[PDB]
Amino acid sequence: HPETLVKVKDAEDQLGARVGYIELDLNSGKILESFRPEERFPMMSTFKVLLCGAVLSRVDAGQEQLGRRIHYSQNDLVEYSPVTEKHLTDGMTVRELCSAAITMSDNTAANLLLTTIGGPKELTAFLHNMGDHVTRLDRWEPELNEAIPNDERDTTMPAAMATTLRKLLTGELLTLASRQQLIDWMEADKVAGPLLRSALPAGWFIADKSGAGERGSRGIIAALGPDGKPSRIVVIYTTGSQATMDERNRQIAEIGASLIKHW
Ligand SMILES: *[B]([O])([O])[C]([C]C1=[C][C]=[C]C(C([O])=O)=[C]1)[N]C([C])=O
Structure with missing residues:
Protein backbone atom coordinates (compact mmCIF):
# COMPACT_ATOMS: atom_id res chain seq x y z
CA HIS A 1 0.00 0.00 0.00
CA PRO A 2 1.36 3.42 -0.90
CA GLU A 3 0.87 4.65 2.66
CA THR A 4 3.67 2.19 3.60
CA LEU A 5 5.88 3.86 1.02
CA VAL A 6 5.23 7.17 2.73
CA LYS A 7 6.69 5.63 5.89
CA VAL A 8 9.63 4.20 3.99
CA LYS A 9 10.47 7.62 2.57
CA ASP A 10 9.98 9.12 6.05
CA ALA A 11 12.46 6.53 7.44
CA GLU A 12 15.03 7.56 4.78
CA ASP A 13 14.51 11.16 5.92
CA GLN A 14 14.82 10.27 9.59
CA LEU A 15 17.86 8.06 9.09
CA GLY A 16 19.64 10.21 6.51
CA ALA A 17 20.19 7.00 4.53
CA ARG A 18 18.92 4.71 1.73
CA VAL A 19 16.18 2.20 2.63
CA GLY A 20 15.37 -0.66 0.26
CA TYR A 21 12.07 -2.40 0.72
CA ILE A 22 9.99 -5.05 -0.92
CA GLU A 23 6.70 -6.82 -0.19
CA LEU A 24 6.16 -10.03 -2.09
CA ASP A 25 3.19 -12.38 -2.34
CA LEU A 26 4.31 -15.78 -1.10
CA ASN A 27 1.99 -17.80 -3.18
CA SER A 28 2.20 -16.10 -6.60
CA GLY A 29 5.45 -14.28 -6.20
CA LYS A 30 3.97 -10.99 -7.31
CA ILE A 31 5.62 -7.78 -6.13
CA LEU A 32 3.15 -5.89 -3.99
CA GLU A 33 5.14 -2.86 -3.10
CA SER A 34 8.76 -1.79 -3.51
CA PHE A 35 11.22 0.99 -2.80
CA ARG A 36 14.72 0.85 -4.36
CA PRO A 37 14.09 -2.84 -5.24
CA GLU A 38 17.14 -3.18 -7.46
CA GLU A 39 19.78 -1.24 -5.59
CA ARG A 40 22.42 -3.27 -3.83
CA PHE A 41 22.63 -3.44 -0.04
CA PRO A 42 24.97 -5.42 2.26
CA MET A 43 23.25 -8.59 3.40
CA MET A 44 25.00 -8.72 6.79
CA SER A 45 23.74 -11.60 8.98
CA GLY A 62 23.22 -37.40 1.42
CA GLN A 63 26.45 -35.35 1.60
CA GLU A 64 25.92 -34.00 5.06
CA GLN A 65 24.26 -35.04 8.34
CA LEU A 66 22.43 -32.71 10.66
CA GLY A 67 23.64 -34.93 13.44
CA ARG A 68 27.26 -34.68 12.45
CA ARG A 69 29.43 -33.13 15.19
CA ILE A 70 31.99 -30.40 14.53
CA HIS A 71 34.80 -29.54 16.91
CA TYR A 72 36.57 -26.22 16.78
CA SER A 73 38.78 -24.37 19.20
CA GLN A 74 39.38 -20.98 20.80
CA ASN A 75 41.19 -19.84 17.60
CA ASP A 76 38.05 -20.09 15.52
CA LEU A 77 36.09 -17.75 17.78
CA VAL A 78 35.03 -14.36 16.39
CA GLU A 79 33.13 -11.39 17.91
CA TYR A 80 29.43 -12.12 18.36
CA SER A 81 29.66 -15.82 19.21
CA PRO A 82 27.27 -16.17 22.12
CA VAL A 83 26.47 -19.77 21.62
CA THR A 84 29.60 -21.25 20.13
CA GLU A 85 31.69 -19.78 22.80
CA LYS A 86 29.92 -21.84 25.40
CA HIS A 87 30.52 -25.19 23.67
CA LEU A 88 34.26 -25.09 23.07
CA THR A 89 34.72 -28.40 24.85
CA ASP A 90 32.23 -30.73 23.20
CA GLY A 91 31.69 -29.11 19.82
CA MET A 92 28.20 -28.91 18.29
CA THR A 93 26.27 -30.68 15.62
CA VAL A 94 25.42 -29.23 12.24
CA ARG A 95 21.86 -28.82 13.40
CA GLU A 96 22.87 -26.78 16.45
CA LEU A 97 25.20 -24.64 14.39
CA CYS A 98 22.38 -23.69 12.04
CA SER A 99 20.11 -23.06 14.99
CA ALA A 100 22.71 -20.83 16.51
CA ALA A 101 23.50 -18.94 13.35
CA ILE A 102 19.76 -18.32 12.68
CA THR A 103 18.16 -17.76 16.07
CA MET A 104 21.11 -15.95 17.65
CA SER A 105 23.16 -14.62 14.77
CA ASP A 106 26.23 -16.49 16.13
CA ASN A 107 29.22 -15.52 13.88
CA THR A 108 31.52 -18.44 14.63
CA ALA A 109 28.69 -20.94 13.90
CA ALA A 110 28.32 -19.39 10.43
CA ASN A 111 32.05 -19.47 9.71
CA LEU A 112 32.19 -23.17 10.63
CA LEU A 113 29.30 -24.00 8.42
CA LEU A 114 30.77 -21.87 5.62
CA THR A 115 33.84 -24.00 5.84
CA THR A 116 31.94 -27.26 5.58
CA ILE A 117 30.24 -26.23 2.36
CA GLY A 118 33.34 -24.85 0.72
CA GLY A 119 33.23 -21.18 1.59
CA PRO A 120 31.67 -18.01 0.14
CA LYS A 121 32.39 -19.05 -3.42
CA GLU A 122 30.27 -22.18 -3.03
CA LEU A 123 27.42 -20.43 -1.24
CA THR A 124 27.54 -17.98 -4.18
CA ALA A 125 27.48 -20.89 -6.67
CA PHE A 126 24.53 -22.47 -4.92
CA LEU A 127 22.56 -19.21 -5.29
CA HIS A 128 23.52 -18.86 -8.90
CA ASN A 129 22.20 -22.35 -9.59
CA MET A 130 18.85 -21.50 -8.07
CA GLY A 131 18.45 -18.50 -10.37
CA ASP A 132 19.85 -15.80 -8.18
CA HIS A 133 22.47 -14.10 -10.26
CA VAL A 134 22.71 -11.04 -8.02
CA THR A 135 23.29 -12.00 -4.40
CA ARG A 136 26.96 -12.81 -3.73
CA LEU A 137 28.91 -13.83 -0.61
CA PRO A 149 29.93 2.44 -0.05
CA ASN A 150 29.51 1.15 -3.60
CA ASP A 151 31.21 -2.10 -2.85
CA GLU A 152 29.42 -5.10 -4.43
CA ARG A 153 30.94 -7.71 -2.18
CA ASP A 154 28.53 -9.48 0.17
CA THR A 155 25.50 -7.67 -1.23
CA THR A 156 22.05 -8.51 -2.49
CA MET A 157 19.11 -6.50 -3.89
CA PRO A 158 15.73 -6.41 -2.07
CA ALA A 159 14.04 -8.10 -5.05
CA ALA A 160 16.76 -10.76 -5.37
CA MET A 161 16.69 -11.70 -1.72
CA ALA A 162 12.86 -11.77 -1.61
CA THR A 163 12.58 -14.05 -4.62
CA THR A 164 15.38 -16.31 -3.40
CA LEU A 165 13.75 -16.65 0.01
CA ARG A 166 10.46 -17.48 -1.64
CA LYS A 167 12.08 -20.28 -3.66
CA LEU A 168 13.78 -21.65 -0.57
CA LEU A 169 10.63 -21.70 1.49
CA THR A 170 8.24 -22.92 -1.20
CA GLY A 171 10.22 -24.31 -4.20
CA GLU A 172 11.06 -27.92 -5.06
CA LEU A 173 14.63 -27.11 -4.16
CA LEU A 174 14.50 -28.51 -0.63
CA THR A 175 12.49 -31.51 0.48
CA LEU A 176 9.37 -30.68 2.55
CA ALA A 177 11.13 -31.83 5.67
CA SER A 178 14.10 -29.49 5.11
CA ARG A 179 11.94 -26.57 4.13
CA GLN A 180 10.16 -26.96 7.44
CA GLN A 181 13.34 -27.23 9.41
CA LEU A 182 14.46 -23.94 7.82
CA ILE A 183 11.20 -22.20 8.64
CA ASP A 184 11.38 -23.67 12.16
CA TRP A 185 14.80 -22.03 12.73
CA MET A 186 13.63 -18.62 11.48
CA GLU A 187 10.47 -18.69 13.46
CA ALA A 188 12.52 -19.24 16.61
CA ASP A 189 14.58 -16.14 16.04
CA LYS A 190 15.66 -14.60 19.44
CA VAL A 191 17.51 -11.39 18.51
CA ALA A 192 14.94 -9.63 16.25
CA GLY A 193 12.49 -8.59 19.03
CA PRO A 194 12.60 -4.81 18.52
CA LEU A 195 12.15 -5.05 14.72
CA LEU A 196 9.18 -6.45 12.88
CA ARG A 197 8.22 -8.64 15.83
CA SER A 198 7.30 -5.56 17.84
CA ALA A 199 4.59 -4.54 15.33
CA ALA A 222 10.75 -12.21 6.96
CA ALA A 223 7.87 -14.40 5.89
CA LEU A 224 4.74 -13.44 7.84
CA GLY A 225 0.98 -13.56 7.75
CA PRO A 226 -2.23 -13.61 9.75
CA ASP A 227 -3.79 -16.59 11.48
CA GLY A 228 -0.58 -18.49 12.00
CA LYS A 229 0.61 -18.91 8.42
CA PRO A 230 2.82 -16.82 6.17
CA SER A 231 1.51 -15.25 3.06
CA ARG A 232 3.99 -12.49 2.30
CA ILE A 233 7.66 -11.94 2.20
CA VAL A 234 9.08 -8.56 3.37
CA VAL A 235 12.73 -7.54 2.98
CA ILE A 236 14.07 -4.31 4.39
CA TYR A 237 17.66 -3.07 4.24
CA THR A 238 19.32 0.20 5.09
CA THR A 239 22.90 1.41 5.07
CA GLY A 240 24.78 4.68 5.44
CA SER A 241 23.07 6.05 8.51
CA GLN A 242 24.91 7.69 11.38
CA ALA A 243 21.92 6.98 13.63
CA THR A 244 22.09 4.77 16.66
CA MET A 245 21.04 1.18 16.69
CA ASP A 246 17.90 2.14 18.63
CA GLU A 247 16.83 4.68 16.00
CA ARG A 248 17.45 2.18 13.25
CA ASN A 249 15.39 -0.49 15.07
CA ARG A 250 12.58 2.03 15.54
CA GLN A 251 12.21 3.04 11.95
CA ILE A 252 12.18 -0.55 10.88
CA ALA A 253 9.46 -1.31 13.39
CA GLU A 254 7.46 1.75 12.26
CA ILE A 255 7.72 0.43 8.69
CA GLY A 256 6.32 -2.88 9.97
CA ALA A 257 3.49 -1.15 11.87
CA SER A 258 2.50 0.51 8.56
CA LEU A 259 2.68 -2.67 6.56
CA ILE A 260 0.52 -4.44 9.13
CA LYS A 261 -2.00 -1.63 9.40
CA HIS A 262 -2.51 -1.75 5.62
CA TRP A 263 -2.42 -5.49 5.21
B1 LIG B 1 25.65 -10.36 10.94
O1 LIG B 1 24.84 -9.03 10.80
O2 LIG B 1 26.63 -10.48 9.78
C1 LIG B 1 26.65 -10.18 12.42
C2 LIG B 1 26.38 -10.56 13.86
C3 LIG B 1 25.13 -9.69 14.13
C4 LIG B 1 25.55 -8.57 15.05
C5 LIG B 1 24.50 -7.64 15.67
C6 LIG B 1 23.04 -7.78 15.29
C7 LIG B 1 22.67 -8.94 14.42
C8 LIG B 1 21.23 -9.27 14.12
O3 LIG B 1 20.94 -10.45 13.88
O4 LIG B 1 20.40 -8.37 14.28
C9 LIG B 1 23.67 -9.88 13.83
N1 LIG B 1 27.19 -8.81 12.47
C10 LIG B 1 28.40 -8.42 12.94
C11 LIG B 1 28.69 -6.91 12.87
O5 LIG B 1 29.22 -9.20 13.45
Missing part, protein backbone atom coordinates in the same frame (compact mmCIF):
# COMPACT_ATOMS: atom_id res chain seq x y z
CA THR A 46 20.67 -12.17 6.88
CA PHE A 47 22.92 -14.40 4.71
CA LYS A 48 22.76 -16.97 7.52
CA VAL A 49 19.44 -18.20 6.21
CA LEU A 50 20.90 -18.78 2.78
CA LEU A 51 23.85 -20.64 4.34
CA CYS A 52 21.63 -23.10 6.23
CA GLY A 53 19.61 -23.48 3.07
CA ALA A 54 22.71 -24.69 1.27
CA VAL A 55 23.53 -26.93 4.19
CA LEU A 56 20.07 -28.42 4.08
CA SER A 57 20.37 -29.12 0.39
CA ARG A 58 23.53 -31.15 1.13
CA VAL A 59 21.73 -33.00 3.83
CA ASP A 60 18.92 -33.85 1.35
CA ALA A 61 21.57 -35.02 -1.08
CA ASP A 138 32.61 -12.93 -0.83
CA ARG A 139 33.98 -12.86 2.75
CA TRP A 140 33.54 -14.49 6.13
CA GLU A 141 32.33 -13.13 9.44
CA PRO A 142 32.83 -10.53 10.49
CA GLU A 143 34.54 -8.79 7.59
CA LEU A 144 31.46 -9.19 5.37
CA ASN A 145 29.76 -6.44 7.42
CA GLU A 146 32.17 -3.70 6.28
CA ALA A 147 29.56 -1.99 4.13
CA ILE A 148 32.03 0.07 2.10
CA LEU A 200 3.13 -8.01 14.88
CA PRO A 201 -0.45 -8.58 16.02
CA ALA A 202 -1.30 -11.51 18.24
CA GLY A 203 -1.90 -14.71 16.34
CA TRP A 204 0.23 -13.81 13.34
CA PHE A 205 2.97 -16.01 12.03
CA ILE A 206 6.56 -14.67 11.68
CA ALA A 207 9.77 -16.36 10.51
CA ASP A 208 12.57 -13.89 10.18
CA LYS A 209 16.30 -13.11 10.16
CA SER A 210 17.96 -9.76 10.99
CA GLY A 211 21.46 -8.38 10.60
CA ALA A 212 23.53 -5.31 11.55
CA GLY A 213 26.85 -4.09 10.15
CA GLU A 214 29.08 -1.06 9.80
CA ARG A 215 28.07 2.33 8.47
CA GLY A 216 24.59 2.16 10.03
CA SER A 217 23.68 -1.03 8.19
CA ARG A 218 20.68 -2.90 9.46
CA GLY A 219 18.21 -5.20 7.78
CA ILE A 220 15.60 -7.88 8.09
CA ILE A 221 14.03 -10.58 5.91
Whole structure:
Protein backbone atom coordinates (compact mmCIF):
# COMPACT_ATOMS: atom_id res chain seq x y z
CA HIS A 1 0.00 0.00 0.00
CA PRO A 2 1.36 3.42 -0.90
CA GLU A 3 0.87 4.65 2.66
CA THR A 4 3.67 2.19 3.60
CA LEU A 5 5.88 3.86 1.02
CA VAL A 6 5.23 7.17 2.73
CA LYS A 7 6.69 5.63 5.89
CA VAL A 8 9.63 4.20 3.99
CA LYS A 9 10.47 7.62 2.57
CA ASP A 10 9.98 9.12 6.05
CA ALA A 11 12.46 6.53 7.44
CA GLU A 12 15.03 7.56 4.78
CA ASP A 13 14.51 11.16 5.92
CA GLN A 14 14.82 10.27 9.59
CA LEU A 15 17.86 8.06 9.09
CA GLY A 16 19.64 10.21 6.51
CA ALA A 17 20.19 7.00 4.53
CA ARG A 18 18.92 4.71 1.73
CA VAL A 19 16.18 2.20 2.63
CA GLY A 20 15.37 -0.66 0.26
CA TYR A 21 12.07 -2.40 0.72
CA ILE A 22 9.99 -5.05 -0.92
CA GLU A 23 6.70 -6.82 -0.19
CA LEU A 24 6.16 -10.03 -2.09
CA ASP A 25 3.19 -12.38 -2.34
CA LEU A 26 4.31 -15.78 -1.10
CA ASN A 27 1.99 -17.80 -3.18
CA SER A 28 2.20 -16.10 -6.60
CA GLY A 29 5.45 -14.28 -6.20
CA LYS A 30 3.97 -10.99 -7.31
CA ILE A 31 5.62 -7.78 -6.13
CA LEU A 32 3.15 -5.89 -3.99
CA GLU A 33 5.14 -2.86 -3.10
CA SER A 34 8.76 -1.79 -3.51
CA PHE A 35 11.22 0.99 -2.80
CA ARG A 36 14.72 0.85 -4.36
CA PRO A 37 14.09 -2.84 -5.24
CA GLU A 38 17.14 -3.18 -7.46
CA GLU A 39 19.78 -1.24 -5.59
CA ARG A 40 22.42 -3.27 -3.83
CA PHE A 41 22.63 -3.44 -0.04
CA PRO A 42 24.97 -5.42 2.26
CA MET A 43 23.25 -8.59 3.40
CA MET A 44 25.00 -8.72 6.79
CA SER A 45 23.74 -11.60 8.98
CA THR A 46 20.67 -12.17 6.88
CA PHE A 47 22.92 -14.40 4.71
CA LYS A 48 22.76 -16.97 7.52
CA VAL A 49 19.44 -18.20 6.21
CA LEU A 50 20.90 -18.78 2.78
CA LEU A 51 23.85 -20.64 4.34
CA CYS A 52 21.63 -23.10 6.23
CA GLY A 53 19.61 -23.48 3.07
CA ALA A 54 22.71 -24.69 1.27
CA VAL A 55 23.53 -26.93 4.19
CA LEU A 56 20.07 -28.42 4.08
CA SER A 57 20.37 -29.12 0.39
CA ARG A 58 23.53 -31.15 1.13
CA VAL A 59 21.73 -33.00 3.83
CA ASP A 60 18.92 -33.85 1.35
CA ALA A 61 21.57 -35.02 -1.08
CA GLY A 62 23.22 -37.40 1.42
CA GLN A 63 26.45 -35.35 1.60
CA GLU A 64 25.92 -34.00 5.06
CA GLN A 65 24.26 -35.04 8.34
CA LEU A 66 22.43 -32.71 10.66
CA GLY A 67 23.64 -34.93 13.44
CA ARG A 68 27.26 -34.68 12.45
CA ARG A 69 29.43 -33.13 15.19
CA ILE A 70 31.99 -30.40 14.53
CA HIS A 71 34.80 -29.54 16.91
CA TYR A 72 36.57 -26.22 16.78
CA SER A 73 38.78 -24.37 19.20
CA GLN A 74 39.38 -20.98 20.80
CA ASN A 75 41.19 -19.84 17.60
CA ASP A 76 38.05 -20.09 15.52
CA LEU A 77 36.09 -17.75 17.78
CA VAL A 78 35.03 -14.36 16.39
CA GLU A 79 33.13 -11.39 17.91
CA TYR A 80 29.43 -12.12 18.36
CA SER A 81 29.66 -15.82 19.21
CA PRO A 82 27.27 -16.17 22.12
CA VAL A 83 26.47 -19.77 21.62
CA THR A 84 29.60 -21.25 20.13
CA GLU A 85 31.69 -19.78 22.80
CA LYS A 86 29.92 -21.84 25.40
CA HIS A 87 30.52 -25.19 23.67
CA LEU A 88 34.26 -25.09 23.07
CA THR A 89 34.72 -28.40 24.85
CA ASP A 90 32.23 -30.73 23.20
CA GLY A 91 31.69 -29.11 19.82
CA MET A 92 28.20 -28.91 18.29
CA THR A 93 26.27 -30.68 15.62
CA VAL A 94 25.42 -29.23 12.24
CA ARG A 95 21.86 -28.82 13.40
CA GLU A 96 22.87 -26.78 16.45
CA LEU A 97 25.20 -24.64 14.39
CA CYS A 98 22.38 -23.69 12.04
CA SER A 99 20.11 -23.06 14.99
CA ALA A 100 22.71 -20.83 16.51
CA ALA A 101 23.50 -18.94 13.35
CA ILE A 102 19.76 -18.32 12.68
CA THR A 103 18.16 -17.76 16.07
CA MET A 104 21.11 -15.95 17.65
CA SER A 105 23.16 -14.62 14.77
CA ASP A 106 26.23 -16.49 16.13
CA ASN A 107 29.22 -15.52 13.88
CA THR A 108 31.52 -18.44 14.63
CA ALA A 109 28.69 -20.94 13.90
CA ALA A 110 28.32 -19.39 10.43
CA ASN A 111 32.05 -19.47 9.71
CA LEU A 112 32.19 -23.17 10.63
CA LEU A 113 29.30 -24.00 8.42
CA LEU A 114 30.77 -21.87 5.62
CA THR A 115 33.84 -24.00 5.84
CA THR A 116 31.94 -27.26 5.58
CA ILE A 117 30.24 -26.23 2.36
CA GLY A 118 33.34 -24.85 0.72
CA GLY A 119 33.23 -21.18 1.59
CA PRO A 120 31.67 -18.01 0.14
CA LYS A 121 32.39 -19.05 -3.42
CA GLU A 122 30.27 -22.18 -3.03
CA LEU A 123 27.42 -20.43 -1.24
CA THR A 124 27.54 -17.98 -4.18
CA ALA A 125 27.48 -20.89 -6.67
CA PHE A 126 24.53 -22.47 -4.92
CA LEU A 127 22.56 -19.21 -5.29
CA HIS A 128 23.52 -18.86 -8.90
CA ASN A 129 22.20 -22.35 -9.59
CA MET A 130 18.85 -21.50 -8.07
CA GLY A 131 18.45 -18.50 -10.37
CA ASP A 132 19.85 -15.80 -8.18
CA HIS A 133 22.47 -14.10 -10.26
CA VAL A 134 22.71 -11.04 -8.02
CA THR A 135 23.29 -12.00 -4.40
CA ARG A 136 26.96 -12.81 -3.73
CA LEU A 137 28.91 -13.83 -0.61
CA ASP A 138 32.61 -12.93 -0.83
CA ARG A 139 33.98 -12.86 2.75
CA TRP A 140 33.54 -14.49 6.13
CA GLU A 141 32.33 -13.13 9.44
CA PRO A 142 32.83 -10.53 10.49
CA GLU A 143 34.54 -8.79 7.59
CA LEU A 144 31.46 -9.19 5.37
CA ASN A 145 29.76 -6.44 7.42
CA GLU A 146 32.17 -3.70 6.28
CA ALA A 147 29.56 -1.99 4.13
CA ILE A 148 32.03 0.07 2.10
CA PRO A 149 29.93 2.44 -0.05
CA ASN A 150 29.51 1.15 -3.60
CA ASP A 151 31.21 -2.10 -2.85
CA GLU A 152 29.42 -5.10 -4.43
CA ARG A 153 30.94 -7.71 -2.18
CA ASP A 154 28.53 -9.48 0.17
CA THR A 155 25.50 -7.67 -1.23
CA THR A 156 22.05 -8.51 -2.49
CA MET A 157 19.11 -6.50 -3.89
CA PRO A 158 15.73 -6.41 -2.07
CA ALA A 159 14.04 -8.10 -5.05
CA ALA A 160 16.76 -10.76 -5.37
CA MET A 161 16.69 -11.70 -1.72
CA ALA A 162 12.86 -11.77 -1.61
CA THR A 163 12.58 -14.05 -4.62
CA THR A 164 15.38 -16.31 -3.40
CA LEU A 165 13.75 -16.65 0.01
CA ARG A 166 10.46 -17.48 -1.64
CA LYS A 167 12.08 -20.28 -3.66
CA LEU A 168 13.78 -21.65 -0.57
CA LEU A 169 10.63 -21.70 1.49
CA THR A 170 8.24 -22.92 -1.20
CA GLY A 171 10.22 -24.31 -4.20
CA GLU A 172 11.06 -27.92 -5.06
CA LEU A 173 14.63 -27.11 -4.16
CA LEU A 174 14.50 -28.51 -0.63
CA THR A 175 12.49 -31.51 0.48
CA LEU A 176 9.37 -30.68 2.55
CA ALA A 177 11.13 -31.83 5.67
CA SER A 178 14.10 -29.49 5.11
CA ARG A 179 11.94 -26.57 4.13
CA GLN A 180 10.16 -26.96 7.44
CA GLN A 181 13.34 -27.23 9.41
CA LEU A 182 14.46 -23.94 7.82
CA ILE A 183 11.20 -22.20 8.64
CA ASP A 184 11.38 -23.67 12.16
CA TRP A 185 14.80 -22.03 12.73
CA MET A 186 13.63 -18.62 11.48
CA GLU A 187 10.47 -18.69 13.46
CA ALA A 188 12.52 -19.24 16.61
CA ASP A 189 14.58 -16.14 16.04
CA LYS A 190 15.66 -14.60 19.44
CA VAL A 191 17.51 -11.39 18.51
CA ALA A 192 14.94 -9.63 16.25
CA GLY A 193 12.49 -8.59 19.03
CA PRO A 194 12.60 -4.81 18.52
CA LEU A 195 12.15 -5.05 14.72
CA LEU A 196 9.18 -6.45 12.88
CA ARG A 197 8.22 -8.64 15.83
CA SER A 198 7.30 -5.56 17.84
CA ALA A 199 4.59 -4.54 15.33
CA LEU A 200 3.13 -8.01 14.88
CA PRO A 201 -0.45 -8.58 16.02
CA ALA A 202 -1.30 -11.51 18.24
CA GLY A 203 -1.90 -14.71 16.34
CA TRP A 204 0.23 -13.81 13.34
CA PHE A 205 2.97 -16.01 12.03
CA ILE A 206 6.56 -14.67 11.68
CA ALA A 207 9.77 -16.36 10.51
CA ASP A 208 12.57 -13.89 10.18
CA LYS A 209 16.30 -13.11 10.16
CA SER A 210 17.96 -9.76 10.99
CA GLY A 211 21.46 -8.38 10.60
CA ALA A 212 23.53 -5.31 11.55
CA GLY A 213 26.85 -4.09 10.15
CA GLU A 214 29.08 -1.06 9.80
CA ARG A 215 28.07 2.33 8.47
CA GLY A 216 24.59 2.16 10.03
CA SER A 217 23.68 -1.03 8.19
CA ARG A 218 20.68 -2.90 9.46
CA GLY A 219 18.21 -5.20 7.78
CA ILE A 220 15.60 -7.88 8.09
CA ILE A 221 14.03 -10.58 5.91
CA ALA A 222 10.75 -12.21 6.96
CA ALA A 223 7.87 -14.40 5.89
CA LEU A 224 4.74 -13.44 7.84
CA GLY A 225 0.98 -13.56 7.75
CA PRO A 226 -2.23 -13.61 9.75
CA ASP A 227 -3.79 -16.59 11.48
CA GLY A 228 -0.58 -18.49 12.00
CA LYS A 229 0.61 -18.91 8.42
CA PRO A 230 2.82 -16.82 6.17
CA SER A 231 1.51 -15.25 3.06
CA ARG A 232 3.99 -12.49 2.30
CA ILE A 233 7.66 -11.94 2.20
CA VAL A 234 9.08 -8.56 3.37
CA VAL A 235 12.73 -7.54 2.98
CA ILE A 236 14.07 -4.31 4.39
CA TYR A 237 17.66 -3.07 4.24
CA THR A 238 19.32 0.20 5.09
CA THR A 239 22.90 1.41 5.07
CA GLY A 240 24.78 4.68 5.44
CA SER A 241 23.07 6.05 8.51
CA GLN A 242 24.91 7.69 11.38
CA ALA A 243 21.92 6.98 13.63
CA THR A 244 22.09 4.77 16.66
CA MET A 245 21.04 1.18 16.69
CA ASP A 246 17.90 2.14 18.63
CA GLU A 247 16.83 4.68 16.00
CA ARG A 248 17.45 2.18 13.25
CA ASN A 249 15.39 -0.49 15.07
CA ARG A 250 12.58 2.03 15.54
CA GLN A 251 12.21 3.04 11.95
CA ILE A 252 12.18 -0.55 10.88
CA ALA A 253 9.46 -1.31 13.39
CA GLU A 254 7.46 1.75 12.26
CA ILE A 255 7.72 0.43 8.69
CA GLY A 256 6.32 -2.88 9.97
CA ALA A 257 3.49 -1.15 11.87
CA SER A 258 2.50 0.51 8.56
CA LEU A 259 2.68 -2.67 6.56
CA ILE A 260 0.52 -4.44 9.13
CA LYS A 261 -2.00 -1.63 9.40
CA HIS A 262 -2.51 -1.75 5.62
CA TRP A 263 -2.42 -5.49 5.21
B1 LIG B 1 25.65 -10.36 10.94
O1 LIG B 1 24.84 -9.03 10.80
O2 LIG B 1 26.63 -10.48 9.78
C1 LIG B 1 26.65 -10.18 12.42
C2 LIG B 1 26.38 -10.56 13.86
C3 LIG B 1 25.13 -9.69 14.13
C4 LIG B 1 25.55 -8.57 15.05
C5 LIG B 1 24.50 -7.64 15.67
C6 LIG B 1 23.04 -7.78 15.29
C7 LIG B 1 22.67 -8.94 14.42
C8 LIG B 1 21.23 -9.27 14.12
O3 LIG B 1 20.94 -10.45 13.88
O4 LIG B 1 20.40 -8.37 14.28
C9 LIG B 1 23.67 -9.88 13.83
N1 LIG B 1 27.19 -8.81 12.47
C10 LIG B 1 28.40 -8.42 12.94
C11 LIG B 1 28.69 -6.91 12.87
O5 LIG B 1 29.22 -9.20 13.45
